[PDB]
């Protein structure tokens, strides 16, 4: 189906194109996924309140890094 509301009808998961899901909260498009990526939209953040890991032969790529 095209739209999965989770509680309120501005919030949940919806079709975002072929093989694409949008993650939505109070009408804001927070992020989504496709066959290769889970992502946030511009200016929307990803926060781990545990560890944040990259395992395997890949890497972390960023613009800049702040270590407190």
């Amino acid at each position: 189906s095209a739209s999965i509301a989770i509680g309120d009808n501005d919030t949940g998961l919806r079709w975002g194109g072929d093989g694409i899901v949008q993650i939505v909260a109070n009408n804001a498009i927070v992020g989504g996924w496709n066959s290769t990526d889970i992502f946030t939209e511009a200016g929307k953040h990803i926060t781990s309140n545990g560890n944040l890991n990259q395992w395997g032969g890949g890497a972390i790529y960023c613009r800049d890094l702040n270590v407190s």
């Binding site: 800049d64 890094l65 702040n66 270590v67 407190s68």
Partner: protein
């Protein structure tokens, strides 16, 4: 140096910067983009503070301590006067195989080659010592806000017949010549050369002031040659400043 695996707190500790791009600059990492693994084993330049006046400085102690820092560059802030322990060795020597990326001298005091020893009898005075021998070229950088001085030559010795006397030591701290008869030249001080032995119109030469040869004796034994301020290869002159003796 930055060490893994905790590269993050290690670079914060080494560089003082939380932002990786600015930590990279402290580690002299110029690639952009850069892999943070390239921080490992690199160090921010080290800054040494010398406020101990030292009239017996040994160039080999400094070489050893520089080599202990490996490739890390070293800045030395010299805030107290320094004199080589002997005129036969420069105060500072920077061998061509030093590993440090660069060495900076920030000179805020007077640094000197040692004065040369006064000659005795028919011998000339001995040469003043050199201040800096530089064999790493532009990897030595000098910010002279004080004085860099080659040592004065020792005075020429005196002899006529059986009378033998000694010349004065070159500035700084050059030894007066000690003759077989204890007709000796004066040791120099830090601030002035030593007087040769004198008897009326007869005398052994006085020591030379910094950067100058010793005086000839009344018997025409020549003074020792002037010590030199900087010898060997040209450093990068951040500030030339006040220099006694030749440099390059």
């Amino acid at each position: 140096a930055v060490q893994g695996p905790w590269v993050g707190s290690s670079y914060v500790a080494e560089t003082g910067q939380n932002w990786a791009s600015l930590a990279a600059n402290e580690l002299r990492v110029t690639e952009r983009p850069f892999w943070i693994s390239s921080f490992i084993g690199r160090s921010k330049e080290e800054i040494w503070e010398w406020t101990g006046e030292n009239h017996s400085f040994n160039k080999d102690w400094l070489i050893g301590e520089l080599r202990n820092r490996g490739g890390t560059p070293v800045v030395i802030n010299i805030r107290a006067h320094q004199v080589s322990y002997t005129p036969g060795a420069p105060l500072f020597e920077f061998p061509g195989d030093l590993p440090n990326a660069y060495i900076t001298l920030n000179i805020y005091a007077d640094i000197y080659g040692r004065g040369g020893t006064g000659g005795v009898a028919y011998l000339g005075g001995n040469p003043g010592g050199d201040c800096i021998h530089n064999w790493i070229g532009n990897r030595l950088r000098i910010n002279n806000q004080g004085w860099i001085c080659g040592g004065g030559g020792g005075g020429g010795g005196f002899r006529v017949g059986h009378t033998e006397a000694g010349g004065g030591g070159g500035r700084p701290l050059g030894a007066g010549g000690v003759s077989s008869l204890n007709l000796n030249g004066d040791n120099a001080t830090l601030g002035a050369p030593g007087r040769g032995y004198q008897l009326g119109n007869d005398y052994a030469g006085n020591g030379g002031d910094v950067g100058n040869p010793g005086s000839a004796s009344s018997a025409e034994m020549g003074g020792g040659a002037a010590g030199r301020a900087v010898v060997g290869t040209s450093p990068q002159w951040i500030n030339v400043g006040n220099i006694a003796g030749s440099w390059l």
